[PDB]
CSV table of N, CA, C and O in Angstrom, one decimal:
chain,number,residue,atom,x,y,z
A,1,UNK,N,12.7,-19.0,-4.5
A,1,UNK,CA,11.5,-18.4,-5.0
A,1,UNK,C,11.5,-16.9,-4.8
A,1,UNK,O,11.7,-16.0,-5.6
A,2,UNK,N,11.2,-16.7,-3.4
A,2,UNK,CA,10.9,-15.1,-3.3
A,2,UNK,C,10.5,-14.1,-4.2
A,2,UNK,O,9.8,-14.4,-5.2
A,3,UNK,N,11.0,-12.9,-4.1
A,3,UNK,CA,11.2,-12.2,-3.0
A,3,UNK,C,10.1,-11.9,-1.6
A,3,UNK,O,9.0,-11.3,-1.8
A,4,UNK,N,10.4,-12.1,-0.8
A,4,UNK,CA,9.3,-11.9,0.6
A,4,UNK,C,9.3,-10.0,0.5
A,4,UNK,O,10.2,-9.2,0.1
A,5,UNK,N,8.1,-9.8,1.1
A,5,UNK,CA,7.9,-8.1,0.8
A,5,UNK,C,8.3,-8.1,2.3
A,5,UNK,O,8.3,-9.0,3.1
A,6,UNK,N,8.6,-6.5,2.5
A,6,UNK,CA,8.8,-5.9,4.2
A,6,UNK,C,7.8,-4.9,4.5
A,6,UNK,O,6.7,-5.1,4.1
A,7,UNK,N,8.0,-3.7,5.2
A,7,UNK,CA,7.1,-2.7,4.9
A,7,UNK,C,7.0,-2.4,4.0
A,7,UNK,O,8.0,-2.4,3.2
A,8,UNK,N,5.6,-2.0,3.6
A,8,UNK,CA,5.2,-1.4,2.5
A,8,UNK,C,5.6,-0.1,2.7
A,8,UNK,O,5.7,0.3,3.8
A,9,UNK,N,5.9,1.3,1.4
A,9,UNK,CA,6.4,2.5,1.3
A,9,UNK,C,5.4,3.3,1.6
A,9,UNK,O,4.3,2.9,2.1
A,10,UNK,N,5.6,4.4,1.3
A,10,UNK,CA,4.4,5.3,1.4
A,10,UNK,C,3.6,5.5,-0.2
A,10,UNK,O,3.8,5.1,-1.3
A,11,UNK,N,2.5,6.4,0.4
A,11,UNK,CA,1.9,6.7,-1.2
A,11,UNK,C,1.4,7.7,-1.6
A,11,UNK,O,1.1,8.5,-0.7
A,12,UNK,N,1.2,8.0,-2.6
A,12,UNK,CA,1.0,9.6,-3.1
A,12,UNK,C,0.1,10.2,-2.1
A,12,UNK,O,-0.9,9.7,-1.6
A,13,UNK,N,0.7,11.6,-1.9
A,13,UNK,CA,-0.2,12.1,-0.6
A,13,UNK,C,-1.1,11.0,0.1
A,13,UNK,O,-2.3,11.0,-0.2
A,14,UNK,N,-0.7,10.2,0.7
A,14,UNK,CA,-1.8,9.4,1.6
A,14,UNK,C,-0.9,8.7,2.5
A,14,UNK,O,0.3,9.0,2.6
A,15,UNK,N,-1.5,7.6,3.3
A,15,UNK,CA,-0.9,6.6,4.4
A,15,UNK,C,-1.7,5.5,4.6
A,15,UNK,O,-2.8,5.2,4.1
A,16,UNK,N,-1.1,5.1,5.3
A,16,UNK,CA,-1.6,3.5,5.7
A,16,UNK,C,-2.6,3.5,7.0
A,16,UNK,O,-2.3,4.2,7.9
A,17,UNK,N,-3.4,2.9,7.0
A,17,UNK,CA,-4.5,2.8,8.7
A,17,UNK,C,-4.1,1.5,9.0
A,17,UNK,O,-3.7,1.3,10.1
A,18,UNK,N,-4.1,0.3,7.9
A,18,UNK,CA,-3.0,-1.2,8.9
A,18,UNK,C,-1.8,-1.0,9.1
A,18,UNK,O,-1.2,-1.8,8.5
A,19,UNK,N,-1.2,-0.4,9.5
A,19,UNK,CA,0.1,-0.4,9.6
A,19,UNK,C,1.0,-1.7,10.2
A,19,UNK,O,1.4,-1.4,11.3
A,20,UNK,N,1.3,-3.1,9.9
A,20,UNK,CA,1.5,-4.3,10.8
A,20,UNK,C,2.6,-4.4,10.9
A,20,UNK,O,3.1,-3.5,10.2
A,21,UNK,N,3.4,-5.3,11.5
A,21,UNK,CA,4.7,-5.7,11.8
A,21,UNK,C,5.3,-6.8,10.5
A,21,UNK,O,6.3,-6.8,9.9
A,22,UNK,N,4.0,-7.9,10.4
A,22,UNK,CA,4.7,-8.8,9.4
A,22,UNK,C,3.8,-8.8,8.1
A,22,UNK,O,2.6,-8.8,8.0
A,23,UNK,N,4.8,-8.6,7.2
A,23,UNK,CA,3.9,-8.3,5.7
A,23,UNK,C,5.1,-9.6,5.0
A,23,UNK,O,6.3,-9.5,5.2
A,24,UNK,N,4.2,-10.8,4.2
A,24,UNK,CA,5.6,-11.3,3.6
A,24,UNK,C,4.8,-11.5,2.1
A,24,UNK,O,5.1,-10.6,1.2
A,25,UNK,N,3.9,-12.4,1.7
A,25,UNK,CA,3.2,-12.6,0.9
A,25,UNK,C,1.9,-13.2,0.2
A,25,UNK,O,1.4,-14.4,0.2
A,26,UNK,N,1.5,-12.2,-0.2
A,26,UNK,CA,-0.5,-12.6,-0.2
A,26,UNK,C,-1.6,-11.9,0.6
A,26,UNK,O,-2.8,-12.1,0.7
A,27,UNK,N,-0.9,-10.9,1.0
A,27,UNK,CA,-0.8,-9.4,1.9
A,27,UNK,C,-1.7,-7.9,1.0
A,27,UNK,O,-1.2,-7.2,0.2
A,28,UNK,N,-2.6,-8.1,1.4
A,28,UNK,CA,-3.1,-6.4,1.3
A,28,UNK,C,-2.6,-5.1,1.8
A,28,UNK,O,-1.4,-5.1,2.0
A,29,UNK,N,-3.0,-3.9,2.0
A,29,UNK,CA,-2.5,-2.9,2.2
A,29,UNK,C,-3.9,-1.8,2.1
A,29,UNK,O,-4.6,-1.8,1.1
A,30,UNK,N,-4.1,-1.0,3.1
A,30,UNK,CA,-5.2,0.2,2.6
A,30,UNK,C,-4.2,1.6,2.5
A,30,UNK,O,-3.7,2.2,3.5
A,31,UNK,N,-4.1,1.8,1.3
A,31,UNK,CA,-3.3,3.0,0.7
A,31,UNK,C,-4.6,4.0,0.5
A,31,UNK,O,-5.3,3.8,-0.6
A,32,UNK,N,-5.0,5.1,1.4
A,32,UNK,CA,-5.8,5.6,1.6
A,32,UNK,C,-5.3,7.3,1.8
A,32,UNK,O,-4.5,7.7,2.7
A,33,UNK,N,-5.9,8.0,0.8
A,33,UNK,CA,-5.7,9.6,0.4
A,33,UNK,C,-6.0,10.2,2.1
A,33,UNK,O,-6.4,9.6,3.1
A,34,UNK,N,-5.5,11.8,2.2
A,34,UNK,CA,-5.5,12.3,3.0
A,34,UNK,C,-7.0,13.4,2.6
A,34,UNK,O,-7.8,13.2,1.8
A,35,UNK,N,-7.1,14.4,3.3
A,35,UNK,CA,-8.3,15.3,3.4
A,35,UNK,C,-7.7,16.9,2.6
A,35,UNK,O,-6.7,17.4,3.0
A,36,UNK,N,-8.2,17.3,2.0
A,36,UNK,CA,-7.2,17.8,1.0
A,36,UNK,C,-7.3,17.3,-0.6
A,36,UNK,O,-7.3,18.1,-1.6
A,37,UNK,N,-7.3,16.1,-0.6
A,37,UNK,CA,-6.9,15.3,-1.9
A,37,UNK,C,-8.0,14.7,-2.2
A,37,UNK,O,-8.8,14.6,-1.3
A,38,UNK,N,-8.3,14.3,-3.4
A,38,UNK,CA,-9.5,13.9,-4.3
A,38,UNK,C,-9.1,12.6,-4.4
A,38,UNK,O,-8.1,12.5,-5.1
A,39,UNK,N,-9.7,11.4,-4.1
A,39,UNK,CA,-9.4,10.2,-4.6
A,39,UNK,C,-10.3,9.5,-6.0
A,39,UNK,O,-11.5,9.5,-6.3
A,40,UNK,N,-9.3,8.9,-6.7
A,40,UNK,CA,-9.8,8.6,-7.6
A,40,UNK,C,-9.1,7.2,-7.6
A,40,UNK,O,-8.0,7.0,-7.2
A,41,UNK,N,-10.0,6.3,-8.3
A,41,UNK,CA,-9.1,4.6,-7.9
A,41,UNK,C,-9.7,4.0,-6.8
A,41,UNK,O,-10.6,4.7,-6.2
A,42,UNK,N,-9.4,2.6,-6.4
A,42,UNK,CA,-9.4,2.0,-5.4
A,42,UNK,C,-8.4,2.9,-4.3
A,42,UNK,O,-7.9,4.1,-4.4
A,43,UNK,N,-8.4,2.2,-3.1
A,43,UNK,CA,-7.7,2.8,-1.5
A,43,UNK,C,-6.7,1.8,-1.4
A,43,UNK,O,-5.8,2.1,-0.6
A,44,UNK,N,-6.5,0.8,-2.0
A,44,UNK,CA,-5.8,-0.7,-1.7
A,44,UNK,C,-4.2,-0.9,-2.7
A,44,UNK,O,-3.9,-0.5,-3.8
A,45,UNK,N,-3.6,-1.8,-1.8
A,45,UNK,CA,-2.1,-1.8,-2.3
A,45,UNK,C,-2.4,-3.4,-2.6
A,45,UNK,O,-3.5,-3.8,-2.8
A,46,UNK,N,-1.3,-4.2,-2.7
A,46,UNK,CA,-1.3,-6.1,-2.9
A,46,UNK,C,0.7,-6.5,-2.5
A,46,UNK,O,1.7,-5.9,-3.0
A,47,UNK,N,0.6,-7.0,-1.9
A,47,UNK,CA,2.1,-7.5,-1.9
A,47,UNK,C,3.0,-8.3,-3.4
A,47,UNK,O,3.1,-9.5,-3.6
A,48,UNK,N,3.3,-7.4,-3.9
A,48,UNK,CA,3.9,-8.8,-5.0
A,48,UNK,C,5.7,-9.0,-5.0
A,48,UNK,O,6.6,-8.6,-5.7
A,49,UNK,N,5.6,-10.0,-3.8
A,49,UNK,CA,7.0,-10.3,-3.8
A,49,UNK,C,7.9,-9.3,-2.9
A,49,UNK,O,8.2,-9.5,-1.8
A,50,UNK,N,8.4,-8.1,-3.9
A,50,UNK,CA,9.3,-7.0,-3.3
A,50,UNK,C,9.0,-5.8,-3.7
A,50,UNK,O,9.8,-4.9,-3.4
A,51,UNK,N,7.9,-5.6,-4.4
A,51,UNK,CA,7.2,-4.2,-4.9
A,51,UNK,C,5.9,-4.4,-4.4
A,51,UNK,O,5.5,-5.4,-3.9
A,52,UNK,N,5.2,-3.2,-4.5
A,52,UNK,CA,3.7,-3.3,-4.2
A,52,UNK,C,2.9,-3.1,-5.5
A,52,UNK,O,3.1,-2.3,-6.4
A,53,UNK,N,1.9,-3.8,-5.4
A,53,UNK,CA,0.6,-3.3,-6.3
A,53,UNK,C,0.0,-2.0,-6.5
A,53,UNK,O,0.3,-1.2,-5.6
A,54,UNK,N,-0.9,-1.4,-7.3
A,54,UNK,CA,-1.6,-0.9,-7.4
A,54,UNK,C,-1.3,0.3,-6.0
A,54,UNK,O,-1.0,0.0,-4.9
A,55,UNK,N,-1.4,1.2,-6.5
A,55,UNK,CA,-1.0,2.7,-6.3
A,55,UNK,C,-2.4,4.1,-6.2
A,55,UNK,O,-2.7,4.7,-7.2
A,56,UNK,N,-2.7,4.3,-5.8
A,56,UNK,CA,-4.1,5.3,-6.3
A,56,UNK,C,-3.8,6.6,-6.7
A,56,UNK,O,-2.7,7.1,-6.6
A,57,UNK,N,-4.6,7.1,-7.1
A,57,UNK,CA,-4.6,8.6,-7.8
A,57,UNK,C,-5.3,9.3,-7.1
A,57,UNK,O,-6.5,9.3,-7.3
A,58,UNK,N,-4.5,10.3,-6.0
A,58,UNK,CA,-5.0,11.0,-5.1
A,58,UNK,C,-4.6,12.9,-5.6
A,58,UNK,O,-3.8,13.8,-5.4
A,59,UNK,N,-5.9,12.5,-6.5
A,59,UNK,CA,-5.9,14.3,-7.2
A,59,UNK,C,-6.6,15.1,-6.8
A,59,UNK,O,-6.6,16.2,-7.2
């Protein structure tokens, strides 16, 4: 079946505040802009498999 996800990557200007050890599948993510940057979008990632979801637009 897989693929099982690992760390999640980074994201446009921003970072992560859960940072956890095991991410495999059915896993969230707070992809959350820095101070500086304008968020626009949701803050949140989704595990799907071996990529991640949803990305934000930190303008």
């Amino acid at each position: 079946e897989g693929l099982p996800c690992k760390s999640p990557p980074e994201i446009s200007h921003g970072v992560v505040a859960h940072m956890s050890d095991s991410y495999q599948y059915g896993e969230e993510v707070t992809y959350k802009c820095f101070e500086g940057f304008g968020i626009d979008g949701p803050a949140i990632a989704k595990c799907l498999g071996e990529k991640w979801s949803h990305p934000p637009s930190c303008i």
